[PDB]
Design a protein around this ligand. Structure first.
Ligand SMILES: *[C@H](C)[C@H]1/C(=C/c2[nH]c(/C=C3N=C(/C=C4\NC(=O)C(CC)=C4C)C(C)=C\3CCC(=O)O)c(CCC(=O)O)c2C)NC(=O)[C@@H]1C
Ligand SMILES: *[C@H](C)[C@H]1/C(=C/c2[nH]c(/C=C3N=C(/C=C4\NC(=O)C(CC)=C4C)C(C)=C\3CCC(=O)O)c(CCC(=O)O)c2C)NC(=O)[C@@H]1C
Ligand SMILES: *[C@H](C)[C@H]1/C(=C/c2[nH]c(/C=C3N=C(/C=C4\NC(=O)C(CC)=C4C)C(C)=C\3CCC(=O)O)c(CCC(=O)O)c2C)NC(=O)[C@@H]1C
Ligand SMILES: CCC1=C(C)/C(=C/C2=NC(=C\c3[nH]c(/C=C4\NC(=O)[C@H](C)[C@H]4CC)c(C)c3CCC(=O)O)/C(CCC(=O)O)=C2C)NC1=O
Ligand SMILES: CCC1=C(C)/C(=C/C2=NC(=C\c3[nH]c(/C=C4\NC(=O)[C@H](C)[C@H]4CC)c(C)c3CCC(=O)O)/C(CCC(=O)O)=C2C)NC1=O
Ligand SMILES: CCC1=C(C)/C(=C/C2=NC(=C\c3[nH]c(/C=C4\NC(=O)[C@H](C)[C@H]4CC)c(C)c3CCC(=O)O)/C(CCC(=O)O)=C2C)NC1=O
Ligand SMILES: CCC1=C(C)/C(=C/C2=NC(=C\c3[nH]c(/C=C4\NC(=O)[C@H](C)[C@H]4CC)c(C)c3CCC(=O)O)/C(CCC(=O)O)=C2C)NC1=O
Ligand SMILES: CCC1=C(C)/C(=C/C2=NC(=C\c3[nH]c(/C=C4\NC(=O)[C@H](C)[C@H]4CC)c(C)c3CCC(=O)O)/C(CCC(=O)O)=C2C)NC1=O
Ligand SMILES: CCC1=C(C)/C(=C/C2=NC(=C\c3[nH]c(/C=C4\NC(=O)[C@H](C)[C@H]4CC)c(C)c3CCC(=O)O)/C(CCC(=O)O)=C2C)NC1=O
Ligand SMILES: CCC1=C(C)/C(=C/C2=NC(=C\c3[nH]c(/C=C4\NC(=O)[C@H](C)[C@H]4CC)c(C)c3CCC(=O)O)/C(CCC(=O)O)=C2C)NC1=O
Ligand SMILES: CCC1=C(C)/C(=C/C2=NC(=C\c3[nH]c(/C=C4\NC(=O)[C@H](C)[C@H]4CC)c(C)c3CCC(=O)O)/C(CCC(=O)O)=C2C)NC1=O
Lengths: 162, 197, 172, 172, 162, 172, 162, 162, 172
């Protein structure tokens, strides 16, 4: 699970040595990014309901056939809309967990690994979730180091889906 | 595919650094990096057979004749010969078909990586590698594993690693002891009608 | 494995909810603790060989029967293995101090160490006493007030001591 | 593994003392019957195939359920594995005879063989009976007065008998 | 050699993946230590001759038998003192290399790996070099982040020699 | 394997000299450019899939010989290998941009790449054209003013272009 | 432990074959050397206390700084002299064990394994034990086959330390 | 091949060590019985023609069906008798090679490896060759050191054929 | 591999002929020289570390351009590898002296060693010079009359010199 501290300890254990100043610099970079990551996680946490509702609305605007055509994979009925909102909430929550963790590790362990089999099996287009993550990129309202750290996780999930 | 589920390492003798002179109870390096006589190549092939198939399946029907001939000509490395022993029909029928995925993972980790499994969790983790990628996918994962390499590389017959500590009459149990099948296939052979008196 | 951040992340995923404000404030307190944590890691790493050597010397002074013939630290192979065990345990204590959570110490060091020491005939009480001697050695190195910025470091010292007792209880 | 020298060296290093005069005289005695030891090893090695074949034949004569259809030795492959087991047990008895210590026999042959034969369904009593038949065959071959220099050899014969009885007791 | 940038790139290559926010934070910690490492290496470069001569002299005060007992491994002659001054210059120069690179990778590839064969083969005692690096620890004349980074390299060579 | 500091370290040690003031000031200027370097790495990493897909589409619109049957990029296995090679070359260009030195690129990607492509019959000029399309996309994405604070980034972008040109020259 | 007999078996075991006449000739050489080794070990056991005291005094003669400089690793006080006398006692006892065994196996599994990190973490110079083994090689008084086969172990430990 | 010198060197090479006193004793036993092996090989070389003719006649006496039944694998014609005499000469010459060499290595490289495929392919019964080797045992005429060294290779080929 | 006996055995088997009386007499002379051969092996083995240390010191004294920085024996890793290479080449010379034939030296040491050194940039002329220094050290130690029974040993010395010349010719 990728985190600067866990990967530094994994590297030092794989070479079987103590934590030299290289891993100290890794921890310093984690510690420097940590306040912006926690502030970004708090902002996404208390704006998450509006972000998820707007992201579902943006996906339904770009892909109206999800709301019109029948099917278990589509949001034409109520349960499809609830499952789409819960999936977008899962994406945003794992992005906040990546912001707290300071790496893409929550995305790898929780969402990125095996998402191709889920999209293949239940016939979900990854472009829907890509458009949802683009909505999260466009309207999360952050600036500076908090925006660049949060958009990196959103682009990492976009890169994994596209 | 999917990433292997994480398993914690359990302390085994191969994990720590070996503070020993090789001496008596060292496993002899069977390597092709030095130029060998055909007799020494034959003992190296027999050592690979003894590591993979144990002593019992060193019979003439289980000898891979074309694989031996390609290995003599250095068409393949020692690691590829070990792969061909693991991909052999005899190995698959005798060892793989008579075991589940868990005990076969334990057998292949012992006979290829030279170390025991850490726990049941490692057997669980590599058993789904068996169940999705087949036996060839699993063997290839084990033979491309950094462990296999940093220990044996490409040109050394694998051996049980750190079986016995210096100045110890006895250490860990030898890998030769493990049978083709466990007690489940034993009682299944007993249930089909064998082994009774 | 987990650190102080990803443990709380994993527990929040187990509850399946966003991190609340109190958890983020506690993790920001860990961020404020992080510079002193890095200082403690650097000090134990820089004095690791002295800590291992002095703890081994004081352990074999307090317990002379280990270096006597018939003992477990007897002969050069077992002595080097004992010193390597001190260095390994100290190394994963520094790993757990660096992370802020003892997942690496339990999973990658202390998993199966007790029955390994049982099977080899290694006395786990003496190894635990050596880990204790490493603990006061590393706490004397960390809490040295010279050559560092003044401040309160009781939480990181208590965390290091707890990691050391967690290492010592896994062999005794 | 140990031999007749390195075993006594191992208890001496456990006690941390030099060998006494009596220990060196006992080791000189083992050097004195070392020639009969090498003769015993040579005779069992030369007649190993005959010992394995004759003892397997007599064992399956007295225990016909092994060669009956369904038996544990009931195939060409399982009979080849059983003869290989005889060859292996005989090989390790000769290794113990060569060393003068059964540390190699207890280490690389006997420890865990009982659980292996239980997990296979191999009848360990039948393997013990076959190992015993190898004991009378090998002891009759070793004690052959023809084609060798005559002398007392009861010590090495009793040592081989002890190794064979320890091999039979490890599987029974 | 082992630097934060090399460890980050080698890790991202080890899982075969792009440089996530973890490796970026590793680079930020490298950047925030790199300036202080650069003036630390500059100050050690300017004080190199004095530090090497003083460290060799401190070895000769703590170990006078090196200047008295005749032998190839001792500094009794001018050749031995030249070899000792060359060795201490090597140690201090690789310390400056570690300060420039930001990790003990120059120490690992140039000095730490194989030094056990060096001290066993040519009958050099590591305690002399430990005392000399302790002298470099004593009066290198750095403060703050430059002092903590440079002494971590001095302790890394000391712990490898002990 | 070197980065922008490690290359200077290796050159100075091969000359056996301390780093001069000009080299230290050049590395200080590199540390000043490091934030823009991290921005360039982050932008190419965040738009890697878009770069690879758009570069592949432009390459196979310019070179429809590859996707027609009987072509190298024809069939899903060969096209999957082609897109994997596109993202691998982009990944090691980002690695070289991150390190500030092309040792990772010429040692860990372009090592044996032209021999592999010639032995496979892979058109190396077609891979070079795709690398140029990735270069155009990456220097478009990095030089985007919007969403980032302004500044002069000529040197890092020229370094990225040099990495892409030595990636294209190593396959041509 | 490394010894003609054990080594012969190990070879026959790794090739999975019976003890051929090669192995029997290995046993024959062990038998012809073993009586000289046993008498050599008897003579060294008889001369053990004088040889240990003389070797410790020779180490103090060539290295007087061990008897005047304070420290844990030095023999300035009574505990250091006791540890040194115990060290040459261990050396001479394991040499007698190698004589009895007929191979370097007691040295390999009792003393040579891990002596380097022992000598560096307790700050012990291997040259002290080298000079002690030179005294044992000079004052053991053996002749003939007992002299050369005892000296082969003394130079084996000398080449291991140096 | 498998001789004491070659096996000692291969063992020491695999364990990456110099030739200790163990390998010296291996060469000592090789020298102790090498003279007896050489003069046994000379006695077999001088008596080889009578030994091969008598062994062929003993095989034809034990197995008369070889000299009366038609077949390629049988010695009914003169060609089959020449083939059997050539085979027994091959066996005896490799026995002399093993006596010169000091181990079963000439047998393992020239006769043992591949004799099963020959015996099953060309329909040659190994019991014929076993009886020929038993005649060579009963009629070599060697005594003492030569007899036990020769019959080791005679029995090694017997157990390989049985 | 081959030794002095199996070389003649392989030549006789390639001829398909029994060994002639000249070959038996030559091998009996080899058996007579065998004690001097074992003395030479024992002396070089017992002074191996001194030979490697003194030969390296004299080599990098008369060729100081390799331990100066930028040289091939510069740095601890490189110099440790050079000392290890000297120890390995000396060890295989002892192996070839022990066997009485240069088969093990040529096939497990000298095969590909020139190729390895030119692939790594190791100057093989300097390694050949160091092999000549180990040659002069080993032939001085072997020819020492002190502590050994006096006798003619010039054939063994010339044979060791031949193995050292083979080692020197195969690195450059
Ligand atoms: C018999 C007609 C002739 C003959 C044959 C001979 N062949 C070899 C050795 C080898 N032959 C091969 C060929 C193959 N190995 C394979 O796997 C395959 C396809 C699957 C083929 C075609 C190889 C690879 C070898 C070398 C490896 C090995 O020895 O097995 C020998 C041995 C030569 C030697 O001295 O080593 C011989 C004698 N010889 C004749 O005289 C007949 C004309
Ligand atoms: C004597 C020549 C010089 C000397 C010696 C000295 N040695 C030690 C400590 C140790 N020595 C050993 C060595 C062995 N232990 C073994 O089991 C074996 C194999 C049987 C050997 C060779 C060990 C393990 C130690 C440390 C553990 C212990 O104290 O027993 C010391 C003490 C070092 C300390 O810090 O306490 C000393 C002083 N010192 C001299 O000045 C002499 C020139
Ligand atoms: C000085 C503190 C004491 C001292 C030193 C001394 N050193 C040597 C010899 C060598 N030193 C090294 C060390 C290095 N070589 C490297 O490439 C590096 C990394 C850049 C290091 C650290 C080496 C390799 C040697 C041997 C090869 C050589 O001669 O260059 C000697 C000479 C030993 C000899 O036998 O010739 C000496 C005397 N001696 C003292 O008394 C001081 C207390
Ligand atoms: C990475 C996590 C990990 C650890 C730490 C570990 C410990 C470990 N300690 C061992 C032995 C040992 N451990 C000790 C330790 C001690 N003896 C004492 O008397 C003292 C109380 C104590 C030191 C304070 C000794 C002496 C041995 C030698 C075992 C022997 O050779 O008999 C062994 C047997 C393997 C070997 O020695 O090569 C292991 C695996 N294994 C793992 O996977
Ligand atoms: C790469 C090597 C490296 C390290 C490790 C490092 C650590 C480091 N520790 C710091 C602070 C500190 N370190 C401590 C630690 C302590 N204070 C005490 O009195 C206790 C004895 C002790 C606990 C072990 C404190 C209290 C601070 C100031 C508070 C803070 O910055 O968090 C600072 C802030 C700058 C400063 O004021 O010095 C840094 C950079 N810098 C580097 O370049
Ligand atoms: C080196 C010490 C050692 C030994 C000796 C050993 C014995 C051993 N005997 C086996 C099988 C066997 N063993 C026997 C033996 C017999 N069957 C009978 O009915 C008779 C009572 C007896 C002949 C005396 C047989 C028949 C098998 C075949 C079992 C099977 O493959 O189905 C197996 C499993 C075969 C395999 O994995 O391929 C082992 C490991 N394991 C060790 O580590
Ligand atoms: C390389 C092949 C080889 C071997 C194996 C060998 C063995 C060997 N056995 C010997 C003696 C002997 N061997 C025996 C053995 C026995 N006496 C008996 O009546 C029992 C039937 C039997 C126990 C199995 C005895 C009693 C001696 C004489 C005492 C002794 O030398 O130890 C001797 C002394 C020389 C002699 O008198 O013949 C040798 C060399 N020599 C060789 O060249
Ligand atoms: C022989 C094995 C093989 C397969 C299967 C294959 C598929 C394949 N289809 C592609 C594109 C495409 N496929 C479509 C297909 C469709 N768009 C729609 O709206 C329809 C609903 C649908 C048809 C069912 C489109 C529009 C593209 C172009 C994508 C682009 O240029 O971005 C491409 C991209 C490269 C290119 O432009 O040629 C490949 C490789 N290629 C192969 O070599
Ligand atoms: C160490 C870093 C690394 C490199 C450098 C690498 C390159 C690489 N590209 C390959 C194949 C390939 N590469 C391509 C690429 C292309 N075909 C075209 O027509 C285009 C011009 C171009 C993409 C723009 C194709 C089509 C194959 C498969 C060739 C075949 O299957 O016959 C292969 C063969 C093995 C495989 O398919 O996985 C390798 C090793 N793999 C690595 O791990
Ligand atoms: C972990 C994710 C993360 C990243 C990647 C990051 C990068 C980062 N880039 C910065 C600056 C900058 N970035 C640029 C880059 C550019 N300016 C341009 O107009 C060009 C289009 C472009 C080149 C691609 C410049 C010019 C600066 C200001 C100068 C500097 O700080 O070096 C800063 C300084 C703070 C700021 O002013 O924003 C940071 C922290 N911060 C984070 O938290
Ligand atoms: C296991 C350790 C061990 C070894 C190595 C050993 C060797 C050994 N070398 C011998 C002889 C000898 N060694 C030499 C060697 C030499 N003479 C010289 O003046 C040259 C300086 C030098 C060549 C390097 C000679 C000439 C003989 C007597 C002739 C012979 O026995 O072959 C002898 C015969 C007994 C004797 O007279 O001493 C033995 C046993 N014995 C042992 O127990």
């Amino acid at each position: 699970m990728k985190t600067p501290l866990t990967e530094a300890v994994s590297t030092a254990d794989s070479q079987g040595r103590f934590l030299s100043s290289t891993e100290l610099q890794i921890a310093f970079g984690r510690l420097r990014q940590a306040n912006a990551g926690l502030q970004a996680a708090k902002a996404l946490t208390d704006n998450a309901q509006s972000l998820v509702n707007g992201a579902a609305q943006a996906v339904y605007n770009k892909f109206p056939y999800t709301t019109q055509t029948q099917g278990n994979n589509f949001a034409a009925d109520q349960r499809g809309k609830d499952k789409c909102a819960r999936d977008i909430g899962y994406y945003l929550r794992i992005v906040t967990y990546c912001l707290v963790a300071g790496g893409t590790g929550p995305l790898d362990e929780y969402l990125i690994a095996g998402i191709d089999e889920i999209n293949r099996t239940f016939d979900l287009s990854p472009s829907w979730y890509v458009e949802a993550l683009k909505y999260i990129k466009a309207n999360h309202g952050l600036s500076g180091d908090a925006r660049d750290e949060a958009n990196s996780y959103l682009d990492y999930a976009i890169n994994a889906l596209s | 595919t999917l990433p292997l589920i994480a398993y914690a390492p359990v302390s085994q003798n191969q994990r720590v650094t070996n503070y020993e002179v090789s001496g008596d109870e060292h496993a002899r390096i069977f390597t092709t990096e030095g130029t060998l006589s055909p007799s020494a190549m034959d003992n190296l092939i027999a050592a690979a057979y003894r590591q993979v198939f144990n002593e019992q399946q060193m019979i003439q029907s289980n000898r891979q004749i074309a694989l031996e001939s390609q290995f003599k000509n250095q068409q393949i490395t020692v690691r590829d010969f070990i792969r061909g022993l693991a991909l052999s029909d005899s190995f698959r029928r005798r060892n793989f078909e008579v075991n589940n995925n868990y005990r076969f993972v334990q057998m292949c980790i012992q006979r290829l990586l030279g170390r025991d499994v850490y726990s049941e969790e490692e057997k669980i983790a590599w058993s789904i590698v068996i169940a999705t990628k087949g036996l060839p996918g699993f063997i290839n994962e084990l033979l491309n594993s950094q462990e296999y390499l940093e220990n044996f590389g490409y040109d050394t017959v694998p051996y049980q690693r750190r079986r016995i500590l210096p100045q110890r009459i006895s250490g860990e149990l030898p890998f030769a002891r493990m049978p083709r099948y466990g007690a489940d296939h034993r009682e299944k052979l007993e249930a089909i009608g064998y082994f009774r008196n | 494995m987990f650190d102080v951040f990803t443990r709380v992340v994993s527990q929040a995923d187990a509850r399946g909810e966003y991190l609340s404000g109190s958890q983020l404030d506690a993790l920001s307190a860990t961020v404020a603790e992080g510079n002193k944590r890095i200082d403690s890691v650097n000090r134990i790493t820089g004095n690791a060989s002295a800590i291992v050597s002095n703890a081994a010397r004081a352990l074999f002074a307090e317990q002379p029967q280990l270096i006597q013939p018939g003992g477990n630290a007897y002969t050069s192979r077992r002595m080097a293995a004992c010193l390597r065990d001190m260095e390994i345990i100290l190394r994963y204590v520094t790993y757990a101090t660096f992370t802020g959570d003892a997942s690496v110490l339990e999973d990658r060091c202390l998993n199966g160490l007790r029955e390994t020491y049982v099977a080899l005939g290694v006395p786990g009480a003496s190894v635990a006493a050596g880990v204790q001697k490493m603990k006061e050695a590393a706490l004397d190195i960390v809490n040295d007030p010279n050559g560092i910025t003044r401040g309160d470091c009781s939480a990181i010292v208590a965390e290091i001591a707890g990691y050391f007792d967690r290492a010592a209880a896994a062999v005794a």
